[PDB]
């Protein structure tokens, strides 16, 4: 398993990634991935039945989404923010466990649905969902990435892909990828 193998799963014949055609998509049952605009549109969130929002790009830069728990208080939506940067050197894997635990809490509610979003819904938030699928649903990285990519055009940066590969190797050795 290499980063290049994941690049290939994200790429077409000519070697190009694609770009999200919709502001958000349900990538696995009751888990949505989306962009900044959907995060900040509470009426649309309610029509989608979203009860829980994980902002994987929390902050005040043009690469972040400047929301917080208070933004969602009136709506009754439950919030967690992760201040991640979309760069190859950023250590997103430090947040995989707390992200996975938040997703699990959302899904434990009978009618719970979680939006995991960042600025573009392209790199940061899909990486967290792929890690959740590996850690909590026992899917190997290729099948987790492939199911998300089947449902939304994503492109985690190569640092995030490397982090997913390191996770996969560890979980495989521990015998934790046997669904």
Curated annotation (Swiss-Prot):
Reactions that this protein is recorded to catalyse: O-phospho-L-tyrosyl-[protein] + H2O = L-tyrosyl-[protein] + phosphate; O-phospho-L-seryl-[protein] + H2O = L-seryl-[protein] + phosphate; O-phospho-L-threonyl-[protein] + H2O = L-threonyl-[protein] + phosphate
GO annotation terms (biological process): cellular response to epidermal growth factor stimulus; dephosphorylation; negative regulation of cell migration; negative regulation of chemotaxis; negative regulation of epidermal growth factor receptor signaling pathway; negative regulation of ERK1 and ERK2 cascade; negative regulation of JNK cascade; negative regulation of MAPK cascade
EC nos: 3.1.3.16, 3.1.3.48
A matching Pfam family: DSPc
Family in the record: Belongs to the protein-tyrosine phosphatase family. Non-receptor class dual specificity subfamily.
Transmembrane segments: none
Quaternary structure and partners: Microtubule inner protein component of sperm flagellar doublet microtubules. Interacts with VRK3; this interaction activates DUSP3 phosphatase activity.
Location of this chain's protein in the cell: Nucleus; Cytoplasm, Cytoskeleton, Flagellum axoneme
CDD domains associated with the record: DUSP3
UniProt name for this protein: Dual specificity protein phosphatase 3
Function, as annotated: Shows activity both for tyrosine-protein phosphate and serine-protein phosphate, but displays a strong preference toward phosphotyrosines. Specifically dephosphorylates and inactivates ERK1 and ERK2.
Main enzyme class: hydrolase
The Tyrosine-protein phosphatase domain, residue ranges: 22-173
Cystine connections: none
GO molecular function, one term: phosphatase activity
Organism: Homo sapiens (Human)
Alphabetically ordered keywords of this record: Cell projection, Cilium, Cytoplasm, Cytoskeleton, Flagellum, Hydrolase, Nucleus, Protein phosphatase
Signal peptide (residue range): none
Gene Ontology, cellular component aspect: cytoplasm; cytoskeleton; cytosol; immunological synapse; motile cilium; nucleoplasm; nucleus
Active-site residues (renumbered): 118
């Amino acid at each position: 398993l290499s980063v290049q193998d994941l690049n290939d799963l994200l790429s077409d014949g000519s070697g190009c990634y694609s770009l999200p055609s919709q502001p958000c998509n349900e990538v696995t049952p009751r888990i949505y991935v989306g962009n900044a605009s959907v995060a900040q549109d509470i009426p649309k969130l309610q029509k989608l039945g979203i009860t829980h929002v994980l902002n994987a790009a929390e902050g005040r830069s043009f690469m972040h989404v400047n929301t917080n728990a208070n933004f969602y208080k009136d709506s009754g939506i439950t919030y967690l923010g992760i201040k991640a940067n979309d760069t190859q050197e950023f250590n997103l894997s430090a947040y995989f466990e707390r992200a996975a635990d938040f997703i699990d809490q959302a899904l434990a509610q009978k009618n719970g649905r979680v939006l995991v979003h960042c600025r573009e819904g392209y790199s940061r938030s899909p990486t967290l969902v792929i890690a959740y699928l590996m850690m909590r649903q026992k899917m190997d990285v290729k099948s987790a990435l492939s199911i998300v990519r089947q449902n939304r055009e994503i492109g985690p940066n190569d640092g995030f892909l490397a982090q997913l590969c390191q996770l996969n190797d560890r979980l495989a050795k521990e015998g934790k990828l046997k669904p």
